[PDB]
Design a protein around this nucleic acid. Structure first.
Ligand SMILES: [K+]
Ligand SMILES: [K+]
Ligand SMILES: [K+]
Ligand SMILES: [K+]
Ligand SMILES: [K+]
Ligand SMILES: [K+]
Ligand SMILES: [K+]
Ligand SMILES: [Mg+2]
Ligand SMILES: [Mg+2]
Ligand SMILES: [Mg+2]
Ligand SMILES: [Mg+2]
Ligand SMILES: [Zn+2]
Lengths: 65, 220, 226, 128, 119, 119, 101
RNA sequence: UAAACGAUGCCUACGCUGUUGUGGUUAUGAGCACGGCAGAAGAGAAAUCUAGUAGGGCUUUGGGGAGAGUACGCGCGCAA
């Protein structure tokens, strides 16, 4: 439904109006370092983006994984 | 740890000759995490190699995620860094913009010839400020090469590298091109074609090209 | 007599082909940049009301040059509302202009219960505040069967949004109709996005529909060309 | 000097707005401990450590994504059980969730436990 | 493309007691739909009270200056008598270019430059 | 007060960008080319255009005009850009480098043939 | 409304400063506010140096210079055109002027 | 008594970055006290920011223009 989108980095809902929200998709590495059909997916709000804070935060979470 | 395509000794050497690691004198709270010491003689900050390889790998990964590669838009509005974009985009199937980025050209339907982006790439993003600003209206991520003096709000992936020297610009673009091709299986090893490509991308004056023409013709 | 719509934008291609629904649009926070997109789904149902007409003036060597400024609301009495202003030489032209702005700024409005979850949801979920210029508005949930305790302009807006009971308070220069209209629309909007205790568990994830349908759109690229 | 229970609240409110996950709080008293321990029972904060520095005291805490706001009331008004719902309606956003904390002869308790135990007390603070 | 017809459509609607705005808007649609590349309409008089005014409308392309005005531009003027006084109507239309010379001039304007495409 | 103007200048640039292979230094040649390649009706305008074309041609020839694209020059540029120097700094296996870099090498045990810059 | 962030003067962290007198009209002006101008002028004009070369008794001669610091009040500086009115964004630009001769 | 003005009360908090000063101290990496400057984010009717966040403590003080900081009484002062 219309009310089920939540930001991964700031843990609050994203409103339908936010032009600066974006979704980031990345592939997963294969054995011997090649590519695969499976995707990482992140939903990120505009508030982090206006500040500049997203650069470091994403680097943290790829390490967490 | 992050799963990254392995470093190889000649590649490492290559970047060091290309002077990728020489930052400026200033630094920013966003970029402290990439520096590893300062030159006692010069006050120049030195960039961490292992981190540079990491974010280069991370960029490559997400370039692979978007079908119909034409929808990737590469921009770089400066000579001294021009031809790199023109070749790089062809190596992956992307579209490009070369001169002044006409403001409104993503926003406004009437301005022809530039596609609605799904991913924007920028080099030396002190110029091309408009491009980073405008992509924000159309829900596109942004990837930029950047240096310790400068800082950006909307850039999602900041690849750290020298951006103020023609040696350096060539190195970043040349390597990243190869990774994207490798990740897809278009090539079998990355050390294959170093001095050929890295030179092709490197910027040269008209005055040099005259000399090289005359030399080449004498050799022919 | 009528003109057929050719979609100017990528999302526009999907709606005309019939590959998408209006909840999916709002759910993924996609931009709307063609009014026809809203017409396609809601044309049969939209009501509108003009909140204010006023005359504005610019002084020149020759005299005052003058124009008509109109502000209105579009809404469906169920879920959707949007607010729009336009300026033109003529009151008709101004209405045409205002409607474009309204359609490009429609939003879905959530609802809730004053007490227990018996029957249908009828009020705003949570007490919230909206600010525009010198004007501040606060909305509070209300028991079923109280009706709309609301001032002149804001009352129309709650009705179009499909709210049945509310309590309202207000501060500032409410004579300025544009500020009072925008502030009240922000108040309900802010209430819908409040971080409810359940929200973290209700979370779902999906790939963006424009990336999901890339194959079809690539066929449409070649079909237009050939 | 600032009130210690006021200082606690502003420290966590600002850090939450700035999107930090953890903070150090610099001056701690007996009721500050009990307040934090209340927020842990209802799952608003996750991890607590106390540092025994011989200089007043200090705490390190992990914040959850569920915390929107908290605050202290000054002064600490006395309330009969008849009065508490008035304060509940003034402070909290909804009838469905959130906590108003009251000190009593039975420790810190919330506005629901007041009905169960049949006791008023003194008003202390709130969170949602 | 005949301004003398359209002006009499306008004059009729005044006697039919229909607002000038609606009447003029209709006239402009008819002129444009029939292929005119632009037109000008002015109404003048005791139109909305005791103080007289004139209201002028422009659409598309209209030429005012030089010899190109004598070959592309067509004009008509009329007036309607009402209980309060005479209301005057001016209509001007710019004809389309026409390679067979029926609807307008064969040769396009003297100042237009066109460069041919390459093989 | 003899300024070509925006119509004349636009037309002239389109002509040089597409017919450079047909033009020369001479006004009288250049006028025969524009009489063929363009639809200019006014006698005064075709003289203005042909005069403007000669001036552009001599600029493009005597080291360049920016923001003007000539196809056969793009061909020359590409063939020139398609070259690698004999001289290189990539193939020398030995290197001298800063002291901090030696400590960065030490912290990651990097294999090679690095030496301190003598300075 | 407040036109300048620094109130048009260079005083900060002080109560009071010494006054000086305007070169053109002798008005009192605070030292931290006065418009200042530096001059280094040859005693002998450029149009005479070619005569000096035949007039002097010495093998070589260096002309003596004269040195001045001048102070002006706002009204005089504007009227003599040492300074001019500037737009709302230009007002913020600060650059050192040339030494006069 | 002053346009006694940074027209911004006093203690005490929580708070982003870069740069430049003054005085001590230094594992030479930096700190502590007192400043200037330039952005950001929030805020505000805007201009702008001693103005961000907040039921921390205590004092002064305003309530549409005028008449009026004037009349009568009182206290200080040689008078003003
Ligand atoms: K007249
Ligand atoms: K003073
Ligand atoms: K000054
Ligand atoms: K006073
Ligand atoms: K001080
Ligand atoms: K204020
Ligand atoms: K008195
Ligand atoms: Mg003309
Ligand atoms: Mg003034
Ligand atoms: Mg005091
Ligand atoms: Mg009063
Ligand atoms: Zn003076």
């Amino acid at each position: 439904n219309s009310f089920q989108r939540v930001c991964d980095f700031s843990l609050k809902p994203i409103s339908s109006q936010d032009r600066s929200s974006v979704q980031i998709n990345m592939v997963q590495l294969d054995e011997r370092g090649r590519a695969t059909k499976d995707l990482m997916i992140f939903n990120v709000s505009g508030t982090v983006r206006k500040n500049g804070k997203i650069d470091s935060m994403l680097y943290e979470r790829i390490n967490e994984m | 740890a992050v799963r990254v395509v392995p470093l190889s000794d000649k590649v490492a050497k290559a970047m060091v000759q290309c002077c990728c690691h020489l930052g400026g004198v200033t630094s920013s709270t966003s970029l402290k995490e990439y520096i590893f010491g300062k030159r006692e003689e010069d006050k120049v900050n030195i960039i961490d190699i292992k981190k540079m390889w990491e974010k280069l790998n991370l960029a490559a990964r997400m370039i692979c995620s978007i079908p119909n590669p034409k929808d990737i838009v590469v921009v770089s509005s400066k000579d001294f860094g021009r031809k790199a974009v023109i070749k790089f985009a062809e190596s992956i199937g992307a579209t490009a913009v070369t001169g002044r980025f006409i403001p409104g050209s993503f926003s406004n339907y009437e301005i022809k010839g530039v596609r609605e982006p799904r991913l924007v790439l920028v080099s030396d993003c002190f110029a091309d400020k408009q491009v980073v600003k405008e992509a924000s209206y159309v829900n596109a991520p942004c990837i930029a090469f950047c240096n310790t003096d400068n800082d950006i709000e909307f850039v999602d992936m900041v690849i750290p590298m020298n951006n103020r020297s023609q040696s350096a610009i060539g190195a970043g673009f040349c390597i990243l091109s190869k990774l994207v091709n490798y990740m897809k299986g278009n090539i079998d090893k990355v050390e294959d074609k170093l001095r050929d490509h890295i030179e092709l991308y490197t910027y040269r004056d008209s005055d040099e090209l005259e000399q090289l023409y005359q030399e080449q013709k004498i050799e022919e | 007599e009528e003109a057929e719509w050719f979609p100017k934008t990528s999302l526009g291609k999907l709606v005309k082909a019939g590959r998408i629904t209006l909840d999916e649009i709002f759910g993924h926070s996609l931009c709307i940049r063609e009014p026809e997109i809203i017409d396609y789904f809601l044309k049969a149902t939209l009501k509108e009301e003009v909140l204010v007409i006023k005359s504005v003036q610019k002084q020149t060597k020759a005299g005052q040059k003058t124009r008509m400024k109109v502000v209105l609301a579009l809404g469906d009495h169920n879920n959707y509302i949007g607010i729009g202003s336009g300026v033109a030489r003529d009151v008709v032209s101004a209405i045409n202009a205002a409607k474009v702005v309204a359609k490009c700024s429609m939003r879905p409005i959530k609802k809730g219960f004053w007490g227990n979850e018996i029957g249908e949801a009828h009020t705003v979920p949570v007490k919230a505040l909206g600010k525009c210029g010198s004007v501040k508005v606060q909305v509070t949930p209300a028991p079923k069967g109280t009706g709309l305790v609301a001032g002149g302009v804001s009352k129309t807006i709650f009705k179009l949004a499909g709210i049945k009971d509310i309590f309202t308070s207000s501060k500032g220069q409410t004579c300025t109709t544009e500020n009072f209209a925008r502030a009240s629309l922000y108040a309900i909007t802010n209430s819908t996005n409040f971080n409810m205790p359940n929200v973290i568990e209700e979370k779902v994830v999906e790939l963006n529909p424009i990336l999901k349908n890339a194959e079809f759109l690539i066929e449409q690229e070649q079909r237009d060309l050939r | 000097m600032m009130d210690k229970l006021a200082n606690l609240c502003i420290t966590i409110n600002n850090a939450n707005r700035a999107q930090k996950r953890s903070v150090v709080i610099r001056r701690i008293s007996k009721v500050c401990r009990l307040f934090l321990e209340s927020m842990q029972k209802h799952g608003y904060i996750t991890d607590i450590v106390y540092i025994d520095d011989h200089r007043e005291g200090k705490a390190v805490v992990g914040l959850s994504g569920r915390l929107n706001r908290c605050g202290a009331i000054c002064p600490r008004y006395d309330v009969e059980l008849k009065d508490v719902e008035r304060y509940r309606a003034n402070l909290l956003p909804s009838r469905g969730f959130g906590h108003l904390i009251v000190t009593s002869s039975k420790g810190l308790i919330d506005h629901r436990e007041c009905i169960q135990h049949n006791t008023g007390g003194k008003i202390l603070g709130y969170f949602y | 493309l005949c301004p003398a017809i359209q002006a009499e459509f306008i004059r009729s609607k005044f006697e039919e007691n229909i607002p000038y705005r609606r009447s003029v808007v209709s006239a402009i649609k008819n002129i444009k739909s029939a292929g005119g590349q632009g037109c000008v309409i002015e109404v003048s008089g005791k139109l909305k009270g005791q103080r007289a005014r004139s209201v002028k409308t422009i659409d598309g392309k209209i030429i005012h200056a030089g010899q190109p005005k004598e070959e592309f531009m067509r004009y008509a003027t009329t007036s309607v008598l009402l209980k309060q006084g005479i209301i005057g109507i001016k209509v001007g239309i710019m004809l389309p270019q026409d390679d067979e010379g029926i609807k307008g001039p064969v040769y396009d304007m003297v100042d237009k430059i066109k460069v041919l495409p390459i093989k | 007060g003899q300024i070509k103007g925006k119509s004349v200048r636009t037309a002239s640039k389109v002509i040089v960008e597409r017919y450079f292979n047909r033009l020369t230094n001479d006004f009288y040649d250049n006028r025969n080319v524009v009489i063929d390649v363009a639809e200019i009706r006014s006698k005064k305008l075709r003289n203005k255009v042909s005069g403007c074309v000669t001036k552009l041609y001599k600029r493009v020839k005597k080291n360049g005009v920016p923001g003007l694209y000539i196809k056969e020059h793009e061909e020359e540029r590409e063939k020139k850009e398609s070259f690698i120097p004999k001289i290189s700094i990539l193939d020398e296996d030995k290197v001298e480098v800063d002291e901090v870099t030696m400590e960065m090498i030490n912290q990651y045990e990097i294999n090679g043939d690095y030496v301190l810059a003598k300075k | 409304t407040k036109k300048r962030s620094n109130n048009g003067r260079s005083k900060k962290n002080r109560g009071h400063t010494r006054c000086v007198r305007c070169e053109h009209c002798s008005a009192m002006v605070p030292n931290d506010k006065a418009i200042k101008k530096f001059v280094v002028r040859s005693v002998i004009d450029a149009a005479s140096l070619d005569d000096l070369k035949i007039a002097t008794i010495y093998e070589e001669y260096e002309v003596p210079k004269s040195y001045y610091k001048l102070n002006y009040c706002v009204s005089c500086a504007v009227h003599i055109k040492l300074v001019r009115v500037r737009s709302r964004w230009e007002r913020k630009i600060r650059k050192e002027q040339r030494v006069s001769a």
